[PDB]
Amino acid sequence: EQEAHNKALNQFKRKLLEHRRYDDQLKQRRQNIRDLEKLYDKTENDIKA
Amino acid sequence: NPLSIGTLEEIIDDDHAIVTSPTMPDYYVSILSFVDKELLEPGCSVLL
Amino acid sequence: GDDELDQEILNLSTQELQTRAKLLDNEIRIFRSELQRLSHENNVMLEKIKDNKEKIKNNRQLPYLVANVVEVMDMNEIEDKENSESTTQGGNVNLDNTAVGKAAVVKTSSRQTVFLPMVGLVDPDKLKPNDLVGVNKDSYLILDTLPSEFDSRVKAME
Amino acid sequence: MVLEATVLVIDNSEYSRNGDFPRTRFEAQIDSVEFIFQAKRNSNPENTVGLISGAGANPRVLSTFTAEFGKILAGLHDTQIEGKLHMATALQIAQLTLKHRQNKVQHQRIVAFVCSPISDSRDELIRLAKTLKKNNVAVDIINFGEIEQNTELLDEFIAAVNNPQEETSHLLTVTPGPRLLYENIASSPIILEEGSS
Amino acid sequence: PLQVARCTKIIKGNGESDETTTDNNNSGNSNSNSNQQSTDADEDDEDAKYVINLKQIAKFVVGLGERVSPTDIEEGMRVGVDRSKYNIELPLPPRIDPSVTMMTVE
């Protein structure tokens, strides 16, 4: 390493990965609600029929 | 009452028969109560 | 990582990276609230899917009439302010009042024709104006599609 | 304690889009609602908490008592942040909320956040505070809005309610400066809250 | 009475196509119909259904009863169905169009 306080930046690199994967999960579950919506609308028109 | 006229097409030897009625619908009837199966045999007109 | 590494010992000071990390603790706190919210919402949603589709599954099981389709003549889809039909009616402001969605006329083997509002699960791509359909015998709604009928002597050719 | 039903009164102001807690004060409050909710459930699960807002300009119920946090959170999403909490209307609706439940085995507790300068007449609120002691209700006033630039009217009401009771009111003072609102309410009594009997 | 019918079409238990929810028959058939489901991913299919046309000339979709094996269902075979909700009780000898051949058996 360069620094011996780069042992502490291993821990911050670790959070960084977490923070950018939680961004990716918020946009995943909004695309999963958009799929449970078309399937809910698909079955709701049958209820009206 | 009424005793419904059918026409007996054929008998089966398990106490049943297939009637075709002149009113259309066939029926898988049972030969039960006050009947000999020796007075049955193709061409009969029956009381259902 | 493109922040907080040996790339940024060169670029920035490492006490700025000490304070960066305690702001990524603040932002993943906000994001953690927001993910649990969206899980919870999908837990409400899946049981509203289950609710609708169980109904369809009673109708789906036996017995049901077997019929052909006269024609799909349709009616304009529902999204309008005055009617949503293709044939002009008396009076103004309608959309569900006597207005109806797409139309399929089906001809029975009990020998009649019924104008039913067609099932919104069965497409117009699944209806041809001769197509052999199921119809629910208790209340006439196009239940499914089935393949074209063949007489027993034609089955006996095979 | 435990066996306690809590109504949260969330203030909605424009004193809460101000930089006083990271990333904002409104975002701080979100974390706080949840921290409260988990502490009561984890102790005993026969504890439910619901949420009212001061959104609009007359308080609406978002959610009644529930054991599901996911409910409280979903309704907090639904908000108006230009609304204005009025205290006097919010104590009366909360008392009514408390009288709408599925079981009456639960102690009566209100935790009302106050994040605006209070500007409701003192004289009325004396009467509403003494109405609470005759129903066996306690009220935990979290102050972080009124310390900042305003007279301390809420202090006197707390004293009024205090009498020998199963659940007796508490005054918790939370710093307004940045020190994380969520951590500070967690260390203050919220589950180790005593009677006075 | 059991209403005498006649099999016009054996539909197989894989590629049944009774659910058209997540299947086709105007461009498909697959070997499933319910195992392609993403709606909540559940099997809501019965194996083997059959097309009878009645002697009343009314066509209906039927299946098996409580002890009716699907190994017994043969084309052009007459079957008995319930006079109420049509379901196969007892299969029956094929054909009923002959009946003047029983008089030439000697």
From Swiss-Prot, chain A:
N-acetylated by NAT1. It comes from the Eukaryota. The 26S proteasome is involved in the ATP-dependent degradation of ubiquitinated proteins. The regulatory (or ATPase) complex confers ATP dependency and substrate specificity to the 26S complex. Belongs to the AAA ATPase family. This is 26S proteasome subunit RPT4. It comes from Saccharomyces cerevisiae (strain ATCC 204508 / S288c). The gene is RPT4.
UniProtKB/Swiss-Prot annotation, chain C:
It comes from the Eukaryota. It is found in: Cytoplasm; Nucleus. Coiled coil: none annotated. N-acetylated by NAT1. The 26S proteasome is involved in the ATP-dependent degradation of ubiquitinated proteins. The regulatory (or ATPase) complex confers ATP dependency and substrate specificity to the 26S complex. Belongs to the AAA ATPase family. This is 26S proteasome regulatory subunit 6A. It comes from Saccharomyces cerevisiae (strain ATCC 204508 / S288c) (Baker's yeast).
Curated annotation (Swiss-Prot), chain D:
Ubiquitinated, leading to its degradation. Ubiquitination is promoted by HUL5. One of its GO terms (biological process) is proteasome assembly. One of its GO terms (cellular component) is proteasome regulatory particle, base subcomplex. Keywords: Proteasome, Ubl conjugation. Disruption phenotype: Cells are viable. GO terms for molecular function: K48-linked polyubiquitin modification-dependent protein binding; polyubiquitin modification-dependent protein binding. Disulfide bonds: none annotated. Transmembrane segments: none annotated. Belongs to the proteasome subunit S5A family. This is 26S proteasome regulatory subunit RPN10. The gene is RPN10.
UniProtKB/Swiss-Prot annotation, chain E:
Transmembrane segments: none annotated. Belongs to the AAA ATPase family. Residues 22-39 have a biased composition (Low complexity). The chain holds residues 96 to 201 of 467 of the full protein. Interacts with UBR1 and CIC1. It comes from the Eukaryota. This is 26S proteasome regulatory subunit 7 homolog. Present with 105 molecules/cell in log phase SD medium. The N-terminus is blocked. Residues 13-45 are annotated as: Disordered. The modification Phosphoserine is found at residue 69. The 26S proteasome is involved in the ATP-dependent degradation of ubiquitinated proteins. The regulatory (or ATPase) complex confers ATP dependency and substrate specificity to the 26S complex. It is found in: Cytoplasm; Nucleus.
